[PDB]
Amino acid sequence: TVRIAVVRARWHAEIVDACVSAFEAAMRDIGGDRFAVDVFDVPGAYEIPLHARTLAETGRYGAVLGTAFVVNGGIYRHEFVASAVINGMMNVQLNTGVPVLSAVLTPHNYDKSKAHTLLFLALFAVKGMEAARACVEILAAREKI
Amino acid sequence: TVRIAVVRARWHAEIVDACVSAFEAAMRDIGGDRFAVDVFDVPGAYEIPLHARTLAETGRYGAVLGTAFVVNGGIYRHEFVASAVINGMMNVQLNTGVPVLSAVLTPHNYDKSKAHTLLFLALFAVKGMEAARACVEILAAREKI
Amino acid sequence: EAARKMEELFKKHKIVAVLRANSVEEAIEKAVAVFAGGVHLIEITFTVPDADTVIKALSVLKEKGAIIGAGTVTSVEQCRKAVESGAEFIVSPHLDEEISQFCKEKGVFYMPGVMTPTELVKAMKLGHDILKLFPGEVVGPEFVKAMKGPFPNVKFVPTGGVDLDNVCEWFDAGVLAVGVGDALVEGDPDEVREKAKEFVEKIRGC
Amino acid sequence: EAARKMEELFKKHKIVAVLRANSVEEAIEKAVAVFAGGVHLIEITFTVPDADTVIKALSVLKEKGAIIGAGTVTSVEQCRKAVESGAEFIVSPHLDEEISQFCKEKGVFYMPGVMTPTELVKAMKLGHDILKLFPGEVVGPEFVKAMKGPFPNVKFVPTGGVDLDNVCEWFDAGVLAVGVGDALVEGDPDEVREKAKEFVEKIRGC
Amino acid sequence: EAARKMEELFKKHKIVAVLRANSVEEAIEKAVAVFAGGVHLIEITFTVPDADTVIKALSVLKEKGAIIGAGTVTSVEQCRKAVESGAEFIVSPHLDEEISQFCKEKGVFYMPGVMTPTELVKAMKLGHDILKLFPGEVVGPEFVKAMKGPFPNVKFVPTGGVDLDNVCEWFDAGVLAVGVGDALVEGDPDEVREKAKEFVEKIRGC
């Protein structure tokens, strides 16, 4: 059995949860009895790269999926974190040899109105399902190589 | 015979395919019986840098071409991925010693209307042809040095 | 048991959105705009690309009171996919025995389509009290009134031929709920949310 | 194989004349006026006196591009007569299993009539993709549009309810061809030829 | 065999775009705007920079019904390049024996240019029934009508002298297809797509 770790941000947890729940369900439908999913938490998106590296270098995981919802920020600028986190994961991926995937998303324009909170729960659930497929397909590709 | 690997995204596969097909045909016209092309898939643009590194460090390929079509994103921002992927390939290129090339393109403004899907199939076919020339010319330059 | 649950839900909510879209994201944005606008019963046309994906994605609204069903199901194979992927309702444009038997075995609510008195009867013999009138426009509210006499226990959900101006014309005929789409659903997500509110208020009046 | 040939012919010519007359000579004069006016697909109502005689007589136009079929066939015995006497098409006001099996065995094109979603389905199960809507007037273009959703591969030829003013209203709904008669056909042979030209040009526009 | 295929295609589509551009990307954007606008027969002027590149790039539209040929080919060497790089048609401003022999050997359709009765005859003797009138403007529709008498089996595709206002003036003369360019093609890709639609509808009228 191949383990996949998931590293979750705790900001806007309801949105992040919609994604991981969908991911786990999709994993059972696609690779049931082949893959197992271990979920770990971190305070937020900024800590994903390190936690993910630590898991990847442990040797227990075939893949790591980081997830988070980064928002516009209101008063403060978010762009600096969003790019640091994505590039962080890319550096980990390349130097660890583990196909770290991501669902760290930043919306064009997120309002706090319920219309938007509902939209993002549904879209994150979709991203979760897509990530499950990606995990299985990339891991298979890496055996064929 | 020198092998060239191609790593393809599966998003907007029709567009990505227009490029690789043109690439392979151009390679036969330019370097037939000198080069061979091995095509590999990954879920999407984000996984290209790792898959490409793994292939490059295998020793079988003289060059690796990554291809993808990255779009505006609609609801979500695409800039963070597009830059992570291009920089990822640059880091691989420099530290592996393999002239990883790319045709990872992000349009100024991509509509989903058929006028645009048709335009991009044709433009990607052009990029494929150009990449074939680039592969041959850079590999030759690297022997002359 | 499922039929009783649903009969009460249709009486309670009155309007059912019939949703189609050209993509997964578009279907989701519309389903949310419709839900936010006050329409809780939503059918996802099942003949569209990625219908299963849309129904599973919208399961996140289930805990907020949304009911997501599978629209226009014309076969058993589609019913099986609809059942694994949520789908509280299975509805179809025509009566079908294999679909009805499948749906009973799975414990889900099935609402077959009918447009004639001989078809209403066959559907009743098979146990279906709530029927959909697929060919709306062709069969107006006059049908619903006319069939009330001989079939007082048959309730209808017309689809099509229902727009904002005929809201209450249909309910005055004895309609249970209305299968509104291409009005409620069509347009920009903000236009959709506002129209959904207009339909709900027009309906609340009757 | 016959179905593919005919589907292309209906798409190509669009208008089908539905011809009736009180005599053999009258039927012939009208068939020629209609043909000369630009309508190449002609059905000879088979319930009239001397229907076989008219179909054989008009076989002389076959080499000029006319296609002569048998209109309103309601039985197997009539189908047998229609097949011996030419009849490229056999059409009927209602779906019938014996007629369909006969027509398949003889290699001829059969187009059954349908007016409801449950009947469209039975006809599809039997292999008929092109259906006639016999009760035109009662079932308007709204039906054709409505059934496009659940049955995208079913094409229609409405009969009746088609006149010059509604030309293109029907084609805009997804109609394959129109079963025009009692407009195109009625009147003096010179009036008939001129009306046939008006229908063809009005149709060419859409 | 190629000639028969093409004769039917020209009769079917009527308008042929004659495309020139100052770059590969510009040629592609225009070819797509023209195609999207309803014109399926497109010639890529072969005397432009990177003509082979444009024809190969547009092969992606071949599966969508586009036919891409090589415009203004004046030599065998250019014909050879056009043939390797797709080019369903080879057309030229003048009749040429070496080009015709080459094209026959390769199985491609060749349409030579002619502007006089003595040249029509030589082209017919060489087996070319479809001719292009290169010097349009100079040779108007009167020529096409005049030559119909002595040469009833010669069909023409005029190039130049065809604009939106003279659409149908040319078809009324016996024209097979029209080599429209510098009208259809010139301008912004969105202007191009709209003009292509105007030409197609104006043509559909006749």
Author numbering:
A (entry chain B), B (entry chain B): 1 to 145
C (entry chain A), D (entry chain A), E (entry chain A): 1 to 206
Copy text verbatim from the article accompanying this structure deposition.
The glycoprotein complex (GPC) is expressed as a trimer on the viral surface and constitutes the sole target for NAbs. Each GPC protomer consists of two non-covalently bound subunits: the membrane-anchored GP2, which contains the fusion peptide, and GP1, which possesses receptor-binding sites for both alpha-dystroglycan and lysosome-associated membrane protein-1 (LAMP-1), the two receptors involved in viral entry and lysosomal escape, respectively. The development of a recombinant protein vaccine has been hampered by the instability of soluble Lassa virus glycoprotein complex (GPC) trimers, which disassemble into monomeric subunits after expression. Here, we use two-component protein nanoparticles consisting of trimeric and pentameric subunits to stabilize GPC in a trimeric conformation.
